[PDB]
Design a protein around this ligand. Structure first.
Ligand SMILES: [Mg+2]
Ligand SMILES: [Mg+2]
Ligand SMILES: [Mg+2]
Ligand SMILES: [Mg+2]
Ligand SMILES: [Mg+2]
Ligand SMILES: [Mg+2]
Ligand SMILES: [Mg+2]
Ligand SMILES: [Mg+2]
Ligand SMILES: [Mg+2]
Lengths: 63, 225, 240, 128, 53, 125, 109
RNA sequence: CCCGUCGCCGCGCUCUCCCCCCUC
RNA sequence: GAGUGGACGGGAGCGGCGG
RNA sequence: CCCCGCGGACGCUACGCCGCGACGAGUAGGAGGGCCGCUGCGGUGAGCCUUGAAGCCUAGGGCGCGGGCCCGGGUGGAGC
């Protein structure tokens, strides 16, 4: 036996979009490659926001 | 352009080879230096005691600065304070071992978990055999076997520790980077003691196994790994 | 090309030589042996013969495959040990020396006491408890399946024939070269026949092993008898 | 004789017997199909020694030999010659077999075509 | 591709191209969204149902 | 686009066979007959197909022309190779490698052609 | 012409009091009653030879009713000359108290 | 393109010349 | 394909193979 | 400027494939996956079937951790 707790082992986060939109899935494929094969942290932020739900992607007004 | 890049690649491979020879020669000579240093420390303790006994006085050696702690009890029915200190000593499993730098702060933590541990003062041979046979490094949170010096040099090279000899020297003599070298070491997963124990539930000074046995921890180590 | 030298580094223990890097440097005179900087025809041309047939043909050896399987197996990794059996080192128990009396433990000669002669290239022992004593010819046997007794006959200055090798003793058989479907029985040739050469070698070795067996008293009677376990005797207590 | 697979590794089965339902021996109304016990005092669920064992993921087969027949192939249920053609490039690892409802007249043509394509059929002499 | 608009030919009743051309309507370059189509088809097929009880 | 059309038919197609923990795709120009982006014989601007000859001797190598993608009547060019096995494989190898025409399908087409030609020679009793 | 194997008795399986590991068997070699004497028999082939109803093929002989389960001695058990043995199939429980032959085959003497 | 007997590591010989001992 | 930097475009030089 | 060789395995259903490390008790309860199962509808399988459907029986052969499933034999007689 090992004295550990397993209630936080599984991190809860979006690993992929819950959407079935194939156009969103295609540019997720694009930015999954960009995040992996570059050192840019911009690609990593964009990729994780592509996974995000709509309430986590609020609209941005022109103003 | 085919020949020009061929010259460049061969010259790059040569520069890598000469750097590797230079690194090999360095860790070879560092180990030779450590062999000189270890025997100087061993002979100095003998010489200091000899000159004291010649004068009729006593030579009290320095209190040991390094301990090896083995958890001897299991994970069932442990009090909250003992459980916390064992987690801080990285002993979350029975027969797990770890090196502890000795001072007032660490010793008073060892006294809390005394019924749960057997500890003592490892000698040079115990440190060698623990690192060489059961030495694993915590590399990117993974338990990676220390099969190559490159694993040590990549994570601890910024402290000047680039080989198993440097790691062993930093553990045996406590050194400035004991915390980094020791926390790099994954806690040792020792086997059950071959030949059995006396009594895990009582202290060593009353015929059991718990608590501090000064240099008898080395007998326990030979039987456990 | 210079003539190759011996190792110049004696082996004290397997993997470790007697001399260090600098000691071996001076023994090799590397201080003066410093060196600075500085096929197979796949196709063959052949005349083809014939008017306005072209002069020749560029025939390619090892043409391309004419068929491929639907799928293939990837190649193995490289293992760096794992010699073939013909290149394994051969070991022999210190109790087995040329002339030692052995006790066979398996086979039709189970329990017979034979005379060890030499170890072969495959590690199998060559034995002949002389055929006139216990009906064991020049035969191979495995050292793992014999008991080396402490009684020995000096078989130095005897001459084991050179052709007594593993290839000589290997079983020869031949079945179904032109026969494929079994309806007419192939039960011919089954009787192994002793070669006249085997009879010659048997007499050649026995002619110089027997006079040394007769030298020590009642050893021939010992080799005539077989080994057995009596209900009171135990192998762990026996001295062989 | 029979068409050989590409590779025939040794297949290791962690368990060979079936997981029978608890107390399916004592009753006819209880089929041997496995049901997880959920009684408060159920000693099979509590995993007492000497009891009926419960399926768990540790009994899972090696992924290299999973679903593999003793012959070394993996079956693929076909219903006609057209579905037989998909195994043309999977000859050495997958074997066709004809569905039970296929008639005897039509499963003759499946067997003949499979012999032409070197596809192994598990039930070739099935209606004759 | 999306901005590119081919010139589709009109075929006669005999099956051969009659020589007339109609520029491809822009609706054929619209996004193809099978998840939207499946959603609309799923909910619209419930609209011709008869009640049962 | 090939990738866009793949996202539509990767799991919803009349050629899709999902059975026995296996997946096959049965459209005409699919070497290896597998449901995959690389081997799909409908979604790509250039595909290679190898079929048995109609008369039962030789192979038919069909390739997709570049121009008329939306015109399926003229989009495929078929040729029949009815020579010995080694030269048949050489013609298919030169079709794919020399033309730079879809070189990732070269061994798939060669292996399929070998399977077709082997199925045409007489069976063994 | 002679016995050529030591007499042993299948005493039982390796076990606790209430658990039984049938994959290994404990043998009682005759005349071996101390642990230091069991070193000779380590690694020696052992055979459980029994008879059945149906004939089975015999290597180098006509088919007969003799069958055998092969095994070998692995280590010493206890202080009193017991040994442990692994057979290619676990020994049947009907053989407890019956004869096992220890064959001398892989000899080191 | 008969075939990755390959990497790290530890060694041996040759591209130098003399001898010495068995053996053809 | 060949990347822990390569490219041109002239300065003045070496090291090795082509008197 | 590779060419006496014109040639060179597999792969990547990217919802795929591969690697490394640690871990694995569970009532009440929650969550996920289900190429588990039943019935009916829209599509699809140029699907299956009187040369034999469903159902049922079976000391028959197997697959899966499992829910279950496939196949052989028999009976059955019209659908799956
Ligand atoms: Mg838990
Ligand atoms: Mg307790
Ligand atoms: Mg012990
Ligand atoms: Mg207590
Ligand atoms: Mg099973
Ligand atoms: Mg029941
Ligand atoms: Mg209760
Ligand atoms: Mg556990
Ligand atoms: Mg659990």
């Amino acid at each position: 036996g090992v004295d550990i707790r397993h209630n936080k082992d599984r991190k809860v986060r979006r690993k992929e979009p819950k959407s079935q939109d194939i156009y969103l899935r295609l540019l997720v494929k694009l930015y999954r490659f960009l995040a992996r094969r570059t050192n840019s942290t911009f690609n990593q932020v964009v990729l994780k926001r592509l996974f995000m739900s709509r309430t986590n992607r609020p609209p941005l007004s022109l103003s | 352009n085919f020949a020009e890049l061929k010259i460049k690649r061969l010259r790059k491979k040569f520069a890598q080879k000469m750097l590797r020879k230079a690194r090999r020669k360095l860790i070879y000579e560092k180990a030779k230096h450590y062999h000189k240093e270890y025997r100087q420390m061993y002979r100095t303790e003998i010489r200091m005691a000899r000159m004291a006994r010649k004068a009729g006085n006593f030579y009290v050696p320095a209190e040991p600065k390094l301990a090896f702690v083995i958890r001897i009890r299991g994970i069932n029915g442990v009090s909250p304070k003992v459980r916390k200190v064992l987690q801080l000593l990285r002993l979350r499993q029975i027969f797990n071992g770890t090196f502890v730098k000795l001072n007032k702060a660490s010793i008073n933590m060892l006294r809390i978990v005394e019924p749960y541990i057997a500890w003592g003062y490892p000698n040079l041979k115990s440190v060698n055999e623990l690192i060489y046979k059961r030495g694993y490094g915590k590399i990117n949170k993974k338990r990676i076997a220390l099969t190559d010096n490159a694993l040590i040099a990549r994570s601890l090279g910024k402290y000047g520790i680039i080989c198993m000899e440097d790691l062993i020297h930093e553990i045996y003599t406590v050194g400035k980077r004991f915390k980094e070298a020791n926390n790099f070491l994954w806690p040792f997963k020792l086997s059950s003691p071959r030949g059995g124990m006396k009594k895990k539930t009582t202290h060593f000074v009353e015929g059991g196994d718990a608590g501090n046995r000064e240099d008898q921890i080395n007998r326990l180590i030979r039987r456990m790994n | 090309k210079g003539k190759p030298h011996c190792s110049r580094n004696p082996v004290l223990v397997r993997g470790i030589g007697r001399y260090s890097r600098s000691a071996m440097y001076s023994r090799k005179a590397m201080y003066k042996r410093k060196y600075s900087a500085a096929k197979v025809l796949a196709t063959v041309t052949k005349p083809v013969g014939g008017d306005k047939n072209g002069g020749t043909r560029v025939v390619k050896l090892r043409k391309m495959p004419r068929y491929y399987p639907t799928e293939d197996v990837p190649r193995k990794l490289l293992s760096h040990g794992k010699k073939p059996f013909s290149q394994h080192v051969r070991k022999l128990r210190a109790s087995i020396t040329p002339g030692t009396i052995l006790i066979i433990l398996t086979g039709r000669h189970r329990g017979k006491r034979v005379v060890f002669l030499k170890q072969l290239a495959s590690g199998l022992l060559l034995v002949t408890g002389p055929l006139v004593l216990n009906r064991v010819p020049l035969r191979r046997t495995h050292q793992k399946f014999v008991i080396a007794t402490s009684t020995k006959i000096d078989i130095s200055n005897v001459k084991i024939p050179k052709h007594l090798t593993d290839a000589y003793f290997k079983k020869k058989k031949l079945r179904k070269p032109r026969h494929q479907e079994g309806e007419i029985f192939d039960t011919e040739k089954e009787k192994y026949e002793i070669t006249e050469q085997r009879k010659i070698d048997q007499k050649a070795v026995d002619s110089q092993i027997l006079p040394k067996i007769k030298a020590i008293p009642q050893l021939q009677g010992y080799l005539r008898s077989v080994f057995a376990l009596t209900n009171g005797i135990y192998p762990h207590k026996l001295v062989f | 004789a029979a068409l050989r697979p590409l590779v025939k590794p040794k297949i290791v089965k962690k368990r060979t017997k079936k997981f029978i339902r608890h107390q399916s021996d004592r009753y006819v109304k209880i089929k041997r199909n496995w049901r997880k016990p959920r009684g408060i005092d159920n000693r099979v669920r509590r995993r007492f020694k000497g009891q009926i064992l419960m399926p768990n993921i540790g009994y899972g087969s090696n992924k290299k030999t999973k679903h593999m027949l003793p012959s070394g192939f993996r079956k693929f249920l076909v219903h006609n010659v057209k579905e037989l053609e998909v195994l043309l490039m999977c000859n050495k690892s997958y074997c066709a077999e004809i569905a039970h409802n296929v008639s005897s007249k039509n499963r003759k043509a499946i067997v003949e075509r499979a012999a032409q394509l070197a596809i192994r059929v598990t039930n070739p002499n099935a209606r004759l | 591709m999306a901005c590119a608009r081919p010139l589709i030919s009109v075929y006669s009743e005999k099956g051969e191209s009659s020589g007339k051309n109609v520029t491809l309507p822009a609706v054929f370059k619209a996004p193809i969204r099978p998840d939207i189509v499946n959603f609309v088809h799923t909910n619209l097929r419930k609209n011709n149902r008869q009640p049962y009880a | 686009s090939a990738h866009l059309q793949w996202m539509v038919v990767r799991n919803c197609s009349s050629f899709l066979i999902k059975r026995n923990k296996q997946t096959y795709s049965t459209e005409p120009n699919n070497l290896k007959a597998r449901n995959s982006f690389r081997y799909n014989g409908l979604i790509h601007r250039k595909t290679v197909g190898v079929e048995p000859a109609a008369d039962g001797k030789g192979v038919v190598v069909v390739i997709k022309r570049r121009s008329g993608q939306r015109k399926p009547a003229t989009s495929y060019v078929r040729t029949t190779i009815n020579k010995n096995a080694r030269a048949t494989l050489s013609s298919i190898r030169h079709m794919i490698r020399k033309n730079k025409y879809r070189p990732d399908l070269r061994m798939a087409a060669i292996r399929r052609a070998s399977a077709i030609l082997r199925s045409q020679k007489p069976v063994m009793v | 012409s002679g016995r050529l194997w030591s007499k042993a008795i299948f005493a039982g399986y390796k076990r606790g009091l209430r658990n039984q590991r049938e994959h290994t068997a404990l043998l009682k070699i005759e005349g071996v009653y101390a642990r230091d004497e069991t070193e000779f028999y380590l690694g020696k082939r052992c055979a459980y030879v029994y008879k059945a109803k149906n004939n089975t093929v015999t290597p180098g002989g006509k088919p007969n009713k003799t069958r055998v389960i092969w095994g070998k001695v692995t280590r010493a058990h206890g202080n009193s000359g017991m040994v442990r043995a692994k057979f290619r199939s676990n020994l049947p429980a009907k053989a407890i108290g019956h004869r096992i032959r220890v064959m001398l085959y892989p000899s080191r003497i």
